[PDB]
Design a protein around this ligand. Structure first.
Ligand SMILES: Cc1cc2nc3c(=O)[nH]c(=O)nc-3n(C[C@H](O)[C@H](O)[C@H](O)COP(=O)(O)OP(=O)(O)OC[C@H]3O[C@@H](n4cnc5c(N)ncnc54)[C@H](O)[C@@H]3O)c2cc1C
Ligand SMILES: Cc1cc2nc3c(=O)[nH]c(=O)nc-3n(C[C@H](O)[C@H](O)[C@H](O)COP(=O)(O)OP(=O)(O)OC[C@H]3O[C@@H](n4cnc5c(N)ncnc54)[C@H](O)[C@@H]3O)c2cc1C
Ligand SMILES: O=c1ccn([C@@H]2O[C@H](COP(=O)(O)OP(=O)(O)O[C@H]3O[C@H](CO)[C@H](O)[C@H](O)[C@H]3O)[C@@H](O)[C@H]2O)c(=O)[nH]1
Ligand SMILES: O=c1ccn([C@@H]2O[C@H](COP(=O)(O)OP(=O)(O)O[C@H]3O[C@H](CO)[C@H](O)[C@H](O)[C@H]3O)[C@@H](O)[C@H]2O)c(=O)[nH]1
Lengths: 392, 392
């Protein structure tokens, strides 16, 4: 009369594996993880390019960073981190600029050196139209943070290619992902802890699912097998991390997502751009940015006659496309609210939880997803599986 | 019939303390360290500025870095290190530039973006006059490494103020202290390990001399007390780290040194320059660079209404001045060779060793001095004190 598993988890991304690992290890329960893709790790999956040996982040560059010590201590159970600090340069009108907002950018773009005080004054004038507290959308927030001349030169074009949506229709939270500084500090992130997985992302992800009580089935869509699996384990909750709208057959409508296409190219030169990520802010170029993956790991020594680069292209996610970014327009949020209510119903009726980037239609970085997973574990899943508490 | 001490060490700088600590701790011997100054640590001595609490490197900014793992492991016995990575910006004609040699510098100074390949080609043309293998002096080496336009803009002026000596008369080793890169990596150093002492330099230095078998006498010139001390410990060797020429009363002549004057100023603003060190490469300004010490320790949170800056001025060392830099002209090296022979004589006749920046008239960074000290300990001092082997 035994259930085969104690928990089902849909998706082997960071959210899924964090849920799977915590449940398996801390509660001594058996977890079936179901992954539609041929590999685990979700969008964080990485792979060594054959010719160079250089690790390639297959679904776009993944840079780990957090100010959450709990998360930092947790992820280091599965991987070491290098001392890499992420920096991004921006290409605009044939010149490469220091980035993001700071004295480096300001001095370059305005042609002379600005003191921290002088820079604050200049941006304050150019941000006069709108104040940050009053800013509703991306365009308003960006102008209020870096001034209009910088907004038009480094945000408007890039945002056009990345979203193809009116900047007045995009969330302000999008642009506030970028630090706004009045120093020469061009660190792209401002979190306490930061690094790349020493032995790559896939090793890190494999360590998380390594527990014997965790079984991961690859090439398995949950909607193909849930009719059979759940009867085998009727009491077992389901943690779903795929697209929220798709879970309900797009009943209420289709949430707006962006998806990404990549062009991976091995060049017969040692160094293409001299840096890990170069943003392309001008419209006269179809890609949003270019990754050169050798610069991700300077501590590894790679051949200097070849290098791997990756151009990144953005478009709207079609019916079968894998969604990368939630657009979150006002209409999208309205649609989200309906699915959320349905999600709350699925939790009540079928013990189905919803988590992750796709599961909650949120713009979630790796660390936020893991923190979100730990939250769901601590406050929802663990009390249920261990102490019988309902899931709402 | 006992000697009071087993070893005399003149100077409490990194060389002296490394010698003192190793001898005391590893050989169980008693060391008298004699320091002419009111404080230990030599030029590495640091002090918190009262108003802000910000640590000030009193004798110029000290940034620790090494590729020597042995040294790295050794110094961490006495201090923790922060994750600070040193970066320098250069001020030229009212614009702040990325620095040192790299794509950042090249793109700024030449007004458009250069690929790693394009940058190599450009510099190769501008470095045509002289090849690095053939370069004898500073000017030739610099031109062969960064090309003449960059040399004239960022090296010639700075070198004039720092040395006031013909660049054709200065060692090539001076300019090769700076990494030459064709990436956007603007790390000022290229060593494996790097950091600032978490609790400051003075704490680090005090930990090294902390051993009970080590006695440090401050405000004590060796030439004032050696007549009395050495009879008390006749067999005890002497490790001298003060100026080599001064040790012999400038008998053969005076070695060329540079000395430094500092202007320390507390400004009523939170941020003066947005960065730890700003070089000033133009001649229309008397100082070589400006240090803003709050940017040394971003992990410490300081008041944002005040900041401590320090302008650095360079001149020739007079009779009583403390020497900072060995000039090392051909004439200086000739003079050095004579003192070296005298040094070898003092070793033979009086068991007097010569080490350190001042003791050997060498342009020694902190890590090189410590490595030099460990070398002297392993190969000269320890075999002598422990196994009776002579010092030559
Ligand atoms: C281009 C890009 C760059 C990024 N860079 C960073 C960065 O630098 N730093 C950072 O912290 N974050 C970064 N992120 C964000 C990060 O990738 C996500 O936070 C991360 O993927 C979190 O995992 P998640 O499980 O919530 O979503 P996902 O990892 O996408 O996990 C979802 C998984 O569910 C599976 N799945 C979906 N539907 C089904 C189904 N029906 N049946 C079975 N399986 C299914 C999918 O196959 C997928 O593997 C980046 C994201 C992108 C797109
Ligand atoms: C402006 C500046 C910036 C620097 N920045 C860096 C850096 O960023 N990173 C790095 O690695 N290195 C740096 N250095 C170099 C570093 O300071 C030296 O390597 C370091 O001081 C090594 O110690 P040393 O004992 O060989 O010389 P010193 O530390 O100068 O030690 C000599 C000591 O001997 C004492 N003394 C001299 N004569 C007598 C006497 N007759 N009697 C008693 N005592 C005497 C002096 O008082 C002095 O304290 C910098 C140096 C300068 C000048
Ligand atoms: O040059 C830029 C960069 C960003 N933005 C706006 O800011 C938003 C967010 O920028 P992100 O850099 O965070 O975009 P991504 O989410 O795509 O960023 C991903 O690409 C980066 C590569 O350096 C980092 O890895 C980053 O954390 C990772 O989330 C963008 O939508 C865009 O609208 C710009 O306008 N111009
Ligand atoms: O902008 C510059 C910088 C250096 N040089 C030449 O290169 C030589 C060496 O440069 P250093 O920066 O190493 O000069 P310092 O020895 O004075 O350097 C000290 O000041 C720096 C502050 O960033 C670092 O702490 C450095 O390691 C420390 O030794 C200089 O003599 C100078 O001749 C220039 O021409 N222009």
């Amino acid at each position: 009369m035994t259930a085969r598993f104690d928990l089902f988890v849909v998706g082997s991304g960071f959210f899924g594996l964090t849920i799977a690992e915590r449940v398996a290890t801390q509660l001594d329960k058996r977890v079936l993880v179901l992954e539609r893709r041929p590999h685990i790790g979700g969008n964080a999956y990485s792979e060594a390019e054959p010719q160079t040996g250089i690790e390639v982040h297959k679904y776009g560059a993944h840079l780990f960073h957090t100010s959450n010590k709990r998360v930092w201590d947790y992820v280091r159970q599965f991987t070491d981190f290098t001392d890499y600090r992420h920096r991004v340069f921006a290409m605009h009108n044939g010149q490469a600029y220091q980035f993001p907002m700071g004295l480096g950018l300001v001095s370059q773009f305005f042609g002379k050196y600005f003191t921290p005080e002088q820079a604050r004054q200049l941006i304050a004038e150019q941000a006069a139209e709108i104040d940050t507290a009053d800013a509703q959308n991306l365009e308003e927030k960006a102008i209020s943070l870096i001034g209009r001349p910088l907004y038009e030169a480094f945000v408007k074009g890039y945002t056009a290619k990345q979203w193809q949506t009116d900047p007045k229709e995009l969330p302000a939270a999008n642009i506030t992902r970028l630090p706004v500084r009045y120093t020469f500090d061009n660190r792209y992130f401002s979190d306490t802890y930061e690094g790349l997985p020493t032995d790559g992302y896939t090793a890190w992800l494999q360590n998380m699912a390594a527990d014997h009580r965790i079984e991961v089935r690859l090439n398995t869509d949950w909607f193909d097998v849930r009719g059979q699996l759940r009867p085998g384990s009727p009491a077992a909750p389901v943690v779903y991390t795929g697209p929220l709208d798709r879970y309900f057959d797009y009943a209420e409508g289709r949430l707006g997502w962006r998806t990404l296409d990549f062009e991976v190219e091995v060049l017969p030169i040692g160094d293409f751009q001299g840096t890990a990520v170069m943003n392309y802010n001008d419209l006269d170029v179809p890609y949003t940015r270019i990754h050169e993956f050798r610069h991700f790991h300077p501590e590894r020594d790679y051949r200097t006659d070849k290098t791997v680069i990756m151009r990144e292209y953005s478009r709207f996610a079609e019916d079968d496309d894998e969604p990368y970014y939630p657009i979150n327009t006002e209409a999208d949020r309205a649609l989200l609210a309906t699915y959320r209510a349905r999600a709350k119903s699925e939790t009540a009726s079928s013990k189905v939880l919803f988590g992750g980037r796709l599961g909650t239609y949120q713009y979630l970085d790796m660390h936020m997803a893991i923190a979100s997973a730990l939250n769901m574990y601590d406050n929802v899943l663990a009390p249920h599986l261990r102490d019988g508490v309902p899931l709402l």
